[PDB]
Design a protein around this ligand. Structure first.
Ligand code: A1L6K
Ligand code: A1L6K
Lengths: 263, 260
C-alpha cells in the first residue's frame, strides 16, 4: 500500500461541503507534483478502529481505485493519514451532484430546462462508468443520482459517497451482485427521467419489500419515451440473471440517444 | 357541556386498515353509522396524550366550523385507559402533495394544467381566509396537510422547518402572517408539483439562509405574477405580508385573467 498516500503538509482543508455521521466532506487545495495547487474535495472517513478490517479494506479499495482510469468514473487522487483519521482526496467539481442539479434545472434562475437528449446522455455517461466498473468486477452498492458527480465539461462520473434503490433480491437475502447495481441504475435512470422525484411516490420505506414482491415497479414518467422506460424496466426484472448487463444497457441507451435529433 | 354534542358513541364506528401512521397518531379507514341509518366512509385519527380536556375542546370549536374548503369534524370517540380518536370524512383522492407527485406519472392522474393548479391554491386560500377570519392558527400548513375532496376541490386539514416563517424560527411567535408564509411555500409546492422546498439547502442551513434575504426560487414555467403573489408571502416583516383574504382575491384575478 501507500502508493496512494499524500503527505499531509500538501493538503489545505477548507470548509465542510457536507457533514454525515461516519464522515464529512470538505473542500481543499492539493499541492501537486508540478508546483500547482488543484482544487480537491476531501472525505474524512471514520472507520471501526477496534480492528483493522475497515482500515485494511480502506487502503486496499483505494489501492486499486488509484489504478482506475475512466472519464465517467471519478478519479482517486490519493489518501492522507492524520493523527488517527483517513481521508480520501478527489478532484473538486463546482457543479456538484447530478441529483441537486436536476432539481436546480426546475428553477427559472437555475440551469436551463434539460432537454430529453441531455438526460439520455446523463444516463449514457453513468452506464459507461458502470460498464467499466463491472467489467473489472467492481461492485458499487450505492448507485443513486445523489452519488453521480458533474465534471466541469458537464459529463457525469460515477462516485460513492437507501432501501428504495436496493434490489428485491438484496432486501430479503443479504446479497449483492452486479445485477444489484443494475437495479439501482434503473432507479437512477428513473430519478433522472423525473428530474429528481423521490422514487416510489406514495410508498413508504418499510413497505418496499411487500410492494416489490407483489410485483410492482417504478412507474413510467409523464412524458418518458416508451423505449426509455422499457430499458429501465429491464433493470428491475425479478431474477438478477434476466436483467441486462451494463455493457448491454450502455449500447441500448447509445442507440436510443442517436435515434433522437440534436438538443 | 357540548362535549357530548361532539362525541360519537364508540359502538357506531368500525375501524379498518391504516391509511397512514405517525408516532403521535395513526389514521385508519372506518365505517360510521349515521343518524339516518346509512354508513359513511370516514377517516379515524387516533391521538395519544400523556395523562385531554383541551383536546375535547378543540374538536368542540373545530366542529362548529363549516367551510367547503375546510375539512369537517364528524365527531369524537373515546375508547378504553383513554384512547381518543378523531373522525373525519374519508376522501379517496388523498393528500394534495402525493396527488401532485402522481400527476407526473403516466399511470397516475393526467398532467395538471396551470389553471387547475391555480384552483388548488384558490381553494386553500378560501379555507385559510375562513379560518384566519375566525382567528384560528393552522400552524402546520403544507401541501401534505391539504386533502382532495371527491369533487376535486381542496380542503384544509391538520395532520417541517422549511414551512416555518423566519420570525417564527427566531422566537416561538406565531401569527396568521406566519401561516401566510407557509401558504407561500404551499403555493410553491403546487407550482413545482411536489418538489421539496429549497433544493440543495439543508434543514439546519435554513434560518441562516433565510436571514440573509434568500427566498424560494421561481419555478421554471411559472407565471411572473403567480410568483409575485407567493413572494409577498415571504416578506421579512409579517406586517408587510398580505392577508389570506387579499391573497384569495389576487389568485382569483390571475385565474380569471387566464384563458380557459
Ligand atoms: C449533495 N451535495 C449538496 C452535498 C455534498 C456533500 C459532500 C460533497 C459534495 C461535493 C461537491 C459540492 C458541494 N457543493 N457544490 C456546489 C459542490 O463537490 C464535490 N466534488 C467532489 N466530491 C464531492 O463529494 C464527494 C466526496 C467523496 C467521494 N468519494 C468517492 O467517490 C469514493 C469512491 N471510493 C471507492 N471511495 C473510497 C472508499 C473507501 C476507501 F477506503 C477509499 C476510497 C470514495 O471515497 C465522492 C464525492 C463533492 C456535496
Ligand atoms: C400519503 N398518504 C398516505 C398520507 C395520508 C396519511 C394518513 C391518512 C391519509 C388519508 C387518506 C388516504 C387516501 N389514500 N391513502 C393511502 C390515504 O384519506 C383521508 N381522508 C381523510 N383524512 C385523512 O387523513 C387525515 C387524518 C386526520 C386529519 N385531522 C384533521 O384534519 C384535524 C383538524 N383538527 C383541528 N384536528 C384536531 C386536532 C387536535 C384535537 F384535539 C382535535 C382535532 C384534527 O385532527 C386530517 C387528515 C386521509 C393520507
Amino acid at each position: 500500500l501507500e502508493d496512494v498516500v499524500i503527505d499531509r503538509n500538501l493538503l489545505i482543508l477548507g470548509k465542510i461541503l457536507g457533514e454525515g455521521e461516519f464522515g464529512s466532506v470538505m473542500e481543499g487545495n492539493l499541492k501537486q507534483e508540478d508546483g500547482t495547487s488543484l482544487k480537491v474535495a476531501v472525505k474524512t472517513m471514520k472507520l471501526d478502529n477496534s480492528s483493522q478490517r475497515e482500515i485494511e479494506e480502506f487502503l486496499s479499495e483505494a489501492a486499486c481505485m488509484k489504478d482506475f482510469s475512466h472519464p465517467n468514473v471519478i478519479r482517486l487522487l490519493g489518501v492522507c493519514i492524520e493523527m488517527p483519521k483517513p481521508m480520501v482526496i478527489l478532484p473538486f467539481m463546482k457543479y456538484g451532484d447530478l441529483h441537486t442539479y436536476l432539481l436546480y434545472s426546475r428553477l427559472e434562475t437555475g440551469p436551463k430546462h434539460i432537454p430529453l437528449q441531455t438526460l439520455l446522455k446523463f444516463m449514457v455517461d453513468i452506464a459507461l462508468g458502470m460498464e467499466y466498473l463491472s467489467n473489472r468486477n467492481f461492485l458499487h452498492r450505492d448507485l443513486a443520482a445523489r452519488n453521480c458527480m458533474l465534471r466541469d465539461d458537464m459529463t457525469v462520473c460515477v462516485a460513492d459517497f437507501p432501501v428504495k434503490w436496493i434490489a428485491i433480491e438484496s432486501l430479503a437475502d443479504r446479497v449483492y451482485t452486479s445485477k444489484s447495481d443494475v437495479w439501482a441504475f434503473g432507479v437512477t435512470m428513473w430519478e433522472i427521467a423525473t428530474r429528481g422525484m423521490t422514487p416510489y411516490p406514495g410508498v413508504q420505506n418499510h413497505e418496499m419489500y411487500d410492494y416489490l414482491l407483489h410485483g410492482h415497479r417504478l412507474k413510467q414518467p409523464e412524458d418518458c419515451l416508451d423505449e426509455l422506460y422499457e430499458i429501465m424496466y429491464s433493470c428491475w426484472r425479478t431474477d438478477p440473471l434476466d436483467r441486462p448487463t451494463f455493457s448491454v444497457l450502455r449500447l441500448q441507451l447509445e442507440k436510443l440517444l442517436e435515434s433522437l435529433p440534436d438538443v
